[PDB]
């Protein structure tokens, strides 16, 4: 009916909006990982500097700085991965979920056409019956008519087939909307503590460096 | 006095690995604004998600859309601040070392004038004995001003990264526990 045409237009347009958001993360994950390398490689340069130095107080803190960035590229590495396995794969699998209803809605009208494919051959048996009813032969009178009542129930059979598939996808859609409400609040929190742990560990890293900078005398 | 030869032999390696740390610093700040640009490239596609979304879920989502707009600015602070304290401090001692290395060449220009006039004048001696003192002081003064600046630039940012990280903590926690108890 119309509710089935409804829950197909927006979903196409929603899955489109859903697919357009997954593209950013795949580049964001690529960007942070690129920065993790651009951080450890940068740390690998602040160490050779602190090594190639005549002053002692600076050479001490310079190494103590190059070590800090090596702790950040790991925090960066964990960040991008926890952005991929926990957010990107959270997406790439939900559009996969939307692909199931795209097959169910396909399967729903694959059953409707099956019903019409039964009504397509039903009008033939009555049409063929109209010919064997006029000209003189009693054989095909008791042959095609037996096939009439057969497909007459087949178009009834496929009709009730189409009715029930139309219903199971309604229960299938509602099965999502409740599971989305109770889980997304948690699923969006499950991702934020990673940023929280990163920020806390980020802060917990710089406050440990500050005394190592005052120690320069 | 081998002080001038070894410092020159120190001026060649420290310049080469400072330049290395400089180009790697800008890359770290370049690769940072890239992610910072994506935080506003994310909310652009994130706001367009609640365009056709349930009523109760629309509010659950848009509150984090405002969050990402704030996080785009904070990440813009660190990417810019690191270019003022790392690369710029690293860039400053690429040009002054380039000028400090130019100071020894003139001392040789008074030293070969010392050797040219010795195989025969005191103006090639009074100038060198002044250059072996004026440049001797302008070079040691360049150290204490560099060690202090290296200690200062490392201090200003450690107090900044503390505020930045503690800010974002006071920004994410304003949203996590807002969802733990909706
Ligand atoms: Pt749409
Ligand atoms: Pt190395
Ligand atoms: Pt259709």
Numbering used by the authors:
A (entry chain A): 306 to 522
B (entry chain C): 206 to 325, 343 to 404
Pull text from the paper.
A key component of the recycling machinery is the endosomal sorting complex for promoting exit 1 (ESCPE-1), which rescues transmembrane proteins from the endolysosomal pathway for transport to the trans-Golgi network and the plasma membrane. Twelve out of the 33 annotated mammalian SNXs contain an additional carboxy-terminal Bin/Amphiphysin/Rvs (BAR) domain, and are therefore denoted as the PX-BAR or SNX-BAR subfamily. Herein, we show that ESCPE-1 has a single-layer coat organization and suggest how synergistic interactions between ESCPE-1 protomers, phosphoinositides and cargo molecules result in a global arrangement of amphipathic helices to drive tubule formation.
SNX1BAR and SNX5BAR exhibit complementary polarity at their distal and proximal interfaces. Consistent with previous predictions, the central region of SNX5BAR has a negative patch, whereas the equivalent region in SNX1BAR is neutral.
